[model samples]
Target: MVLYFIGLGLYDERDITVKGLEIAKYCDYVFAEFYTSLMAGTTLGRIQKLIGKEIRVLSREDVELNFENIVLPLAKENDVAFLTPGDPLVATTHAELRIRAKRAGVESYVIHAPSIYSAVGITGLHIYKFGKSATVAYPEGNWFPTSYYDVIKENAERGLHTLLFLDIKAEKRMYMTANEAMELLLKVEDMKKGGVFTDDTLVVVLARAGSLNPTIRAGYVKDLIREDFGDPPHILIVPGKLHIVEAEYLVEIAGAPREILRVNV
Candidate 1:
């Protein structure tokens, strides 16, 4: 018996790789979890229709707390497929599930698909320039998270770009917009005073990636903060010193300001 970890890609069910879809369709049991990241362009019903299988949606608790009990137990006898948004191992803790399958004497395989990590190249920034990534989480109760601010500061200091993943609350259908992420960074900057994020800081916003017409914009935070990138599932990027080619791509393709082409160095 084998457990296949399949990626549903970024924006919709069609984004799934042919290899993943074929395997998922033939699996004895197919399970999916959407709390990590939701596909803004498609729904569970659409995904199920495309894959030609009934997908058992698992909550965060169901997968994280009870994967071994629920998924692996079935995997021991039948071919099971665990579906997730984006590449199964990218930016998710689901990779550890493979270990659980190993301990349970079940074989597991991963099917790669498009993820925001690679789709970021469409923003005209060199993928190799990206540094440590962080998530902008909504502050709840007494906890005010600002670690993401430090991530940006450190990456910028090293002349590397930073990728900021906006938080999502799938059950409540709450998705953090790029504007909201910018606001949180500014608030963190106010407290940390590291000059990591400011109104004048140049940032890039990539929304609804994997879709035909994704919003890719780059400009000073002051201008793009309220510019409306459209829809949720947005990701923010803070590029450090840009290469001339990178600058030109930003300006020409991403609609970045022409001034960014003039590198200070």
Candidate 2:
């Protein structure tokens, strides 16, 4: 009996891998941890049906405070499983849980699955080219963190891509629209004395990658953010240097502006 952390992929129940499916068959209880990311229109029940097990959900706080105190303890005692929407290890917190399991002698096993990371690669930029990641902030409230801009600035300085994760509201079934995300980011960028990303920086908006209507658009940051790339569950990518093939792919394949992406010298 081992504690298994399974990645359920980006879309729905059918996205679970065969190894994960087999593991879930014998597990007494399956738990899913979803906080900032979405489960692609499906819930824990979907996982239960696919894996043929009783599935439980661990809320943001439950996992944050109790992964070690609760989840790890139960998992050590019996065959337990934890789930993540995308690849389990992409986010640092998920990685932390795996480490904690090892420390606690839980004998944890990991099952990898598809993730939303490669969706950014579809934009034609080199996947390895991306640098740090950032999230949008609400400037209206004092709770805003302007360090997000600093992330993009640093990525640009290093000539790498910057992944801008959008906001998600799991319970309300709401998400931050790509258009709204861009607007918020640009507003914050304006606050800086000398901003990192201005209206001229190249930007890409990705929406609904696993679904059929996935959208991708590249242009000047300010203009790209202003354009409506459709509904929620979206993200923004800021590019630093571009290869000629990457530029052609974005322009011809994904309909990006060739003028905005300058070839790396």
Candidate 3:
């Protein structure tokens, strides 16, 4: 018996690679988890239709806490497939599942797919220039989080771009937008008095990546903070000292101001 970890790509059912789809179609059983990141452009029904298998949906607790009890038992006796949004091992902590499969005597393999980590290249920034990524989490009561603010600060200091993943509560159907992230960073600046994120700081918003006509906007935080980028599942980018070509792409392609061509460099 064997197990497969497949990545359902960034946007929809069609995003799954043919290899992943073909493998999943023949699996004895297929299980998937969606809480890691939102596939904002697709539905479970559509995914099910494309894979041609009944998928057993698992919660975070189910996959993280009880994978041995739930999925592995079946894997030992059948060819089972486990699916996750994005590349299976990229942003999610699903790699440990492979170890669990090993202990259970089930051979496992991974099929690759496109992920936002690489998809961010569409923002007109050099892919290799991105440094240390962080997530902008929602503040809960007295537990306000500002670590992501510090991440941007550190990346900026080195003249590297920072990729900020906005928080998502998939179970609640709540996805944080770039505007909320900008507001949170501004609040952190108020508390820390850091020159990291300010009204003059340039930022990029990528909404619903992996789709046709995804929103790509770049400009000062003050100008784009309240501007609507449309839909949830937004990604925020704080680009540090840009190359002239990078600045030009932001201006011509992402609708950034021409002033940034001179000011951002």
Candidate 4:
């Protein structure tokens, strides 16, 4: 008996790698969660159809609070598969789940798939240039998070790119857009004013990344703050100083302004 943590990749059912599919095919039971990040281009039905199993979907509370009790018990005597959108380990507590598996005496294995971590390549920014990553979360009544803004500031100072993940409340079906993320950053800037994020600062927005025709746009924050990138699961990039080739690709491929080739390059 084993536990398989499988990543369904970025956008859809077809994105599942052959290796991951093979493992899921042989599992006695399959469970999944869509709260971390969603496959905006596909549905739970499509994923179930492709994997050929009736997936027991778990909520954030169910998985975080009761994973060991609910899911790990099944793996004691049966091969179980836990599926998640994106690379299962990225931006989620599945890493902790792996620990839970060990304590429960179940052998756990990871099956790899394409994730936004590497899919940012489509934005025309060099992947190796990416620095510390952070997420933009919605502010509650009195609790507001601004550390993500500081992350961009630090990355910019080091001449490295910052990958900012937009927050999601998947149970509520609320996916934060790049526009909202930009607005939050700008609002933070107003308070901090550390010259980190400004209206004219060049930014990149990627939507539905992993789709063949995913939307990629680049420009200053002022122009894109209200501009629609279509659909949810949008990611924001505050790029550092650009190489000439990187600037050129942004202009040609991502619709960035031509001046970037001269100024940022």
Q: Model 4, stretches more than 4 Å misplaced?
A: none
Error of 2 at 163 (Å): 1.2
TM value for model 1:
0.98
Q: Please, what are the lDDT tens digits per residue for candidate 4 over residues 69-144?
A: 9899999999999999989998887899999999999999999889998999998899999999999999999999
Local accuracy of candidate 1 as per-residue lDDT tens digits, 35-98? 9997989999999999888999999999999999999999988999999999989988998899
Instruction: List clash counts for every candidate, in order.
Output: 0, 0, 0, 0
Q: Per-candidate TM vs. native?
A: 0.98, 0.88, 0.98, 0.98
Candidate 2 per-residue lDDT over residues 144-232, each given as its tens digit: 66777788888888988888877665666667776776666677777785567677777777776666667878877656656767655
Answer with 2 or 4, whichever has the higher TM-score. Answer: 4
lDDT of each: 0.94, 0.76, 0.92, 0.93
Considering every candidate listed, which one attains the maximal lDDT? 1
Mark the 10 consecutive residues where model 4 has the least summed lDDT.
256-265
What's the true lDDT of residue 200 in model 2? 75
TM-score computed on alpha carbons, candidate 2? 0.88
Candidate 2 lDDT (Cα, 0 to 1) = 0.76
What ranges in model 1 sit over 4 Å off?
none
Clashes of 1: 0
